[PDB]
Curated annotation (Swiss-Prot), chains A, B:
Record family assignment: Belongs to the ClpA/ClpB family. ClpC subfamily.
Superkingdom: Bacteria
Region (I): 161-408
Gene name of this polypeptide: clpC
Binding residues annotated for ATP, in chain numbering: 206-213, 536-543
Domain Clp R, residue spans: 1-142
SMART domains the UniProt entry points to: AAA, ClpB_D2-small
InterPro entries given in the database record: AAA+_ATPase, ATPase_AAA_core, Clp_ATPase_C, Clp_N_dom_sf, Clp_R_dom, ClpA/B, ClpA/B_CS1, ClpA/B_CS2
Source species: Bacillus subtilis (strain 168)
Lineage: Bacteria, Bacillati, Bacillota, Bacilli, Bacillales
Gene3D superfamilies on file: 1.10.8.60, Clp, N-terminal domain (1.10.1780.10), P-loop containing nucleotide triphosphate hydrolases (3.40.50.300), UVR domain (4.10.860.10)
Molecular function in Gene Ontology: ATP binding; ATP hydrolysis activity
Region (Repeat 2): 78-142
Stretches the record annotates as Repeat 1: 4-69
Pfam families in the cross-refs: AAA, AAA_2, AAA_lid_9, Clp_N, ClpB_D2-small
Entry protein name: Negative regulator of genetic competence ClpC/MecB
Amino acid sequence: FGRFTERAQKVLALAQEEALRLGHNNIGTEHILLGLVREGEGIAAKALQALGLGSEKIQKEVESLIGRGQEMSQTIHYTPRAKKVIELSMDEARKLGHSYVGTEHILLGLIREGEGVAARVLNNLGVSLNKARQQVLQLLGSNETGSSAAGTNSNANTPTLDSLARDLTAIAKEDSLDPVIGRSKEIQRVIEVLSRRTKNNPVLIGEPGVGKTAIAEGLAQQIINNEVPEILRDKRVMTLDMGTVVAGTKYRGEFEDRLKKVMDEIRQAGNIILFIDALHTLIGAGGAEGAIDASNILKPSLARGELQCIGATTLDEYRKYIEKDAALERRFQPIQVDQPSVDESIQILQGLRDRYEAHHRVSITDDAIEAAVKLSDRYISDRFLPDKAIDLIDEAGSKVRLRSFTTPPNLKELEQKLDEVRKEKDAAVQSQEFEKAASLRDTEQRLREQVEDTKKSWKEKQGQENSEVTVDDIAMVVSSWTAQTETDKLLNMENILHSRVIGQDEAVVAVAKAVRRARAGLKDPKRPIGSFIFLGPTGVGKTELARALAESIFGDEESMIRIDMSEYMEKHSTSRLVGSPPGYVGYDEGGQLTEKVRRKPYSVVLLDEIEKAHPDVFNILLQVLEDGRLTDSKGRTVDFRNTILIMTSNVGASELKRNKYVGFNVQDETQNHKDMKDKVMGELKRAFRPEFINRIDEIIVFHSLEKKHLTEIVSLMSDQLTKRLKEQDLSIELTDAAKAKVAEEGVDLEYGARPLRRAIQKHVEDRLSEELLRGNIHKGQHIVLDVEDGEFVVKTTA
Amino acid sequence: FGRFTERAQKVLALAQEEALRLGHNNIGTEHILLGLVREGEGIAAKALQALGLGSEKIQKEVESLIGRGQEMSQTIHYTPRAKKVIELSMDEARKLGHSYVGTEHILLGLIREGEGVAARVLNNLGVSLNKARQQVLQLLGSNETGSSAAGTNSNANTPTLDSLARDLTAIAKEDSLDPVIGRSKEIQRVIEVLSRRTKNNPVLIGEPGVGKTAIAEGLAQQIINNEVPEILRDKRVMTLDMGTVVAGTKYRGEFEDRLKKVMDEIRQAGNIILFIDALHTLIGAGGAEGAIDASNILKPSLARGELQCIGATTLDEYRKYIEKDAALERRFQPIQVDQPSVDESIQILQGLRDRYEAHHRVSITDDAIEAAVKLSDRYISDRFLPDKAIDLIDEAGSKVRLRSFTTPPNLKELEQKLDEVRKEKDAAVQSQEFEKAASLRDTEQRLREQVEDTKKSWKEKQGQENSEVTVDDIAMVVSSWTAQTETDKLLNMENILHSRVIGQDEAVVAVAKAVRRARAGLKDPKRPIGSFIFLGPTGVGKTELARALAESIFGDEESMIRIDMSEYMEKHSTSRLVGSPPGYVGYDEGGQLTEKVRRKPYSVVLLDEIEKAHPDVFNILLQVLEDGRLTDSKGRTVDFRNTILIMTSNVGASELKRNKYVGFNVQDETQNHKDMKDKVMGELKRAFRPEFINRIDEIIVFHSLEKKHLTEIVSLMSDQLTKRLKEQDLSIELTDAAKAKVAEEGVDLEYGARPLRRAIQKHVEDRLSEELLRGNIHKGQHIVLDVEDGEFVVKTTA
């Protein structure tokens, strides 16, 4: 593909050189073979030299076939035989892993490609074809680092380390083990609990889901050099892997038997460290079901400190073991792995760029990496700070890499042409029209080389992305889920949120700016990026700003939870009829609110109508706003850590639903507006407790329901129709003028504002179907619905 | 059959020729054998030529059978033996795939016919019967299609692709892989989301049920050829199939072990793409019973980026898996797979026309394909807008092919006759009565050839169908379920809705036009294709139009749901109507209302009396009308996308259930009318809350009992009686005159129009049984119930 070592590439060019030297017009394998032996003593080349082949001998044999004298060897490239040998070398390097493919693989691939002039060339020059593949194989690869250690020994390690299992310290003598960056400050906290054989167990608690495992490689490095105590000197850190135990087993009894064996071998006691990943599963205590009960052997082992071990558990798992104090709590003593510092994240990123240069686009951009964290940290916000991050890096680290190869410069037109040639050419010969295809044939390859030349002119579009992962790039990719087009979303938040909330600017700018402050630098995870009270009418403004955050602020597209406290309130029976679903906040804690935001930890959380809720509820919600967490639903922790909590209120709604009517004058209208954009900030005091509101930030203002507001409601309804018709592949847009015709059949005093949907149906739905059916307009072109004379007008556009 | 290759056909005609040339004016199999070898060196011919047989050698045996003479012909046709050889070859080519039968199959079919004139010719000319079938098998031709290959190799790739589960790439390197038509725009959305080595997992959400699976072959084609990232170059795409896992397994433990092996094999890591269809089952999280939990291994695989995979899930499935989090979140990232819409539908149909031209019906008719789509939307309705569609074409895509092979022109009478001949003949010789069978015998075969000649006139029904699925046919087939007699059902929807709601034209036209416009694929396919409110009293036209709507929009009246909203607030009944209602709005959303429409999306959903319902129910109905789907009730998504939502009212009822009186006018029924065609448009405002109701596509108007509707009620009830009697095979019709005699006992001023059923029983039911009992009328005689002298009158008709 593009990843190759020197020796390889060298064998390849020599084929072409010899192509012309023997007059082999297009070089199949015979020159590739020649290439191998003419590259002298590279692993392919060398191989051929072992069995007894000279550079000469091959070119002469090669020459005894295709031979003289197409010396020019017109547009000297390969033909399919040679191309097959090359495809094979790539795979013969996959074989090893061998990222940048070498010589050996090409001779190996040649044998593999055991026909053409090469294959027989080798079988003519006294070297059987498989004898050649042998020789390369037994000298395989080299493109990767060796071992920085050597020798073989054993001692106490014999009974134990055999079984089961991996020993991190060993692989780090060889220096094939990574730091890992972590969660660096996490690793230190282990050593109180681990150089201690009495709270013999360190116990890592955090998001799973953070790369806890980074800390484990930490230990490896540190037990070697050099802050190691005399305690952990004369110790080995051995990882007990779940995978070897399950392999070759499908019965519980066999698994337990193996665990019994681990305890026997644990005789290295007080000098052994055991690493137990997913520790909870083995104890199997608590819950409605277990998971296997190693606990019988394991508990006394922990108490004695013979099993001096390291436990990896998560946010929720721990409670049902400290409840079993003290035999799990006799060993445990805790450390925070929950959500790493912002900085720790960034460093992991930087480290894995080059392997997303094995997965291309990335290496770099540095700024894009930083962003990977930062943009993610608030913009999803569905994990811990590095998982999110890296996802951007490779996402963007491909999105644009996809744009890398998708055209020539604009010479995509070449390919279009090249197609048409083939056709003409072919079909003409299929009639034959021999020579009537001939010139068409000739036109094909003429075109072709020009095509291919400019398809690799979009190697310039490779040099653009293939070690960058851009700011904007990373950012767009975060938006794709939900620096540049997230920090432009963030910095320009006010501008973008204003374009999706029509009027009632008072609110928009208030949320915008508070969120934009937090969302730029670090408000720093825990607490939503904004707590807010959204005051206003029951109608307009509230939801729409919340929404607008979800689309831009949170990325591109969705991200908004929304619960009404008002919908249930009731419980208890003795003989009563009632058996309704839980009274609402009990439902929320016990399941609904906590689950939903746990599902997407980045959601604009809308806690509706808490005025019409008991003041006790507000305390619970207050924890969401403060902590950025709730712990409910069987001890699970729900990350509201960069959500936007929006607690709504519409207490007094009606006056903020004053329409633009003439009272005294037509200046009662502009005072049905003006009065209402004042009245809102008074619906705040009336809303909830001050204690609640004391954990709630800006005072978001929404107001009125002018006239003005009617034709603004029409513009929500017409868009709901037209979007479901976009689903059906019809592009419609209504100008204000067609929405005007809807208002024409949409005002009475007594009819409210019910006819507006129906009249949109009448003027849009009904009309578009009566305009498409005629053939005046068509689906998937742009169809503009207007009034342009006091009556409705249908326009067409592309 | 319909398709054969030359070599076959050539072998066949040569038999007949040689038959007579040797003195056999009946073509025995002895000549077919001769035929095979007389075609020289085709696979049949050649085969015989191997065994030591020439055409000459065959004809010699043949001449030693009948031999000279019999060159006077017999209008030489085959023997029953010879007809057997042909039937056999068909299967001898089927078994070798081929449905276009070639030479080999014909000798093979001869062998099959291992006793007979051939059989003995071949067994007489000293070659084994099986030696001959061997020879034909061991050379094929006319069974292939042309593909590519020239060698095969592998490397590390071996253990993985073996297992489990084949690669799309392989068959597409032979270039035999299909496009698929798709769902093309879906494939594109993947490449940011997948060419990551992080949250590299695309997850396809759509309807299943739309042809999601089309997208998967998409990847195959684009990852191979030819402009794609360097990321997605140096990759392999492997498809994982559930079927292989379950095979050789019958326990959960074994399944997990196999999955462990797969997980180990993901070692092609960071450059391997695994396709997992129905992804949800493996994660096993959520639900009331979950599924087998692969997640323990799979979750870190997704996080590591070793498992870069493609998830196929549906509308409903996803929620309880992103709920798991957060390496799930840093895995998945969503992309939109086709939500069913008419334009998309057509493109699939057309694509699979040629492939249902295996049915020699469809491919085409163009109008018929479009119709399939458009008609499907309105006439069942239950499935998805493109699945439905293709099914009608293929349905019909056999339907006319059935009408094909059951015709002589009208000469069906011939076959009937030809039978009778045999009888006479047979029975006469069984007495013998030799020549008393003879002339009957002779008469038989005269007939027979005439019969067969006119049965093969119905090659005209082939020339109809073998690329035309009939427009009318598609319609017929949709009518079979529930263009022409479904688009006439559509176009004439108004006419059809009018014929069962007598009076109340006001209502009929309002529903009619809105659906009839809409269902032509020109209205949103994700919202009820007509929303309506039906106002009136309790009954009288309302429901009846809903029924008539089912017929006209959907093709039969059996497309009608009907749910009462007053139960979704319940405060009337609890032990006399419905079991366990409490929770009530929760009962509707959470369960009942949604469950019912989830059973049939092929329904006029008539949600009665939302007026007299808890205000939450109106909000719920509002979601049905807006979204076209609701997701509730274990997170299942109910498609109201091809329902007709109809919300009923009856708060004006009294005038709208009023009856005519004189008072001062005999124009009092027609003054009961005039009041009611007003009374509905005032019952709307009085009934409902505005937020819900305005999404309705038309306000449907009904009437009362008057004088005048009463005598129309008698005609509804009498039709309910006579129809449940049709099941036994009583063919009944009432004229208006008999319904009149019945009316005589139920036009009470003070006992209502309820007595009419009872009086229908006395004058219709009771009367038919008392007319059957005396043998005046009969089953399968059409029985007319009349008055013709002011008293009841019994008539008979065919």
